[PDB]
Amino acid sequence: WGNELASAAARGDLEQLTSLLQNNVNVNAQNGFGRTALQVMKLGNPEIARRLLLRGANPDLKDRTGFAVIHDAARAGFLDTLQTLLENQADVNIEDNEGNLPLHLAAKEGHLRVVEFLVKHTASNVGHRNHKGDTACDLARLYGRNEVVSLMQANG
């Protein structure tokens, strides 16, 4: 179950995932490499995240590098999964090993809509400095994310 559930999530096979969920499974079981189905899930499949969360999947777990799924979602620009993560109590201000919040990663990669949602509709700490002293906006500025910077100073 744990392994197959993780496999179905990793591949983005909702049908197979929902099939497995009919069994008495621990959605927070770790696969062969220590990651849960939610952690290995292929982003771009918010329903898979929703089904896993509905069954009690812990959204705040961190991998080898202290990255939570919301970190991955934010960094890659997957707003839908990020939002379903939050509507299921995932911590928005969870930090990676360098003190970066999901907002930092979104800003750094120039995902304007993700940043906008975070700044405007979440408890994201816009003034949070990572370990090296940089805020999400600083990183946007450093990475030439002009539109993100303008949006951030426009409301925070």
Q: Are 38 and 67 in contact (CB under 8 A)?
A: no
Which among 90, 102, 98, 91 is positioned nearest to 126, based on CA atoms? 102
Is residue 46 left, alpha or beta, with left meaning phi > 0 and alpha meaning psi from -120 to 50? alpha
Q: Which residues contact 55 (CB under 8 A, 6 or more apart)?
A: 21, 25, 27
Collapsing DSSP to helix, strand or coil, 24 comes out as coil
Domains delineated in the chain:
1-156 (1.25.40.20)
Token readout for 11 is 């591949």
What's the one-letter identity of residue 148? V
Resolution, Å (one decimal):
2.0
Angle ∠(52,57,60) on CA atoms, nearest 5 = 125
Q: Identify the DSSP state of 122.
A: S
86: Cβ contacts below 8 Å, ≥ 6 apart: 70, 92, 122
CA proximity to 69, closest of 83, 56, 118: 83
Dmax (CA) for the chain in angstroms is: 49
End-to-end CA distance of the chain: 45
d(C-alpha 145, C-alpha 97), whole Å: 23
Residue 153 is inside which H or E element, if any? Answer: helix 146-154
Contact 57, 89 (CB under 8 A): no
Q: How was this structure determined?
A: X-ray
Q: Which residue has the tokens 């090993």?
A: 97
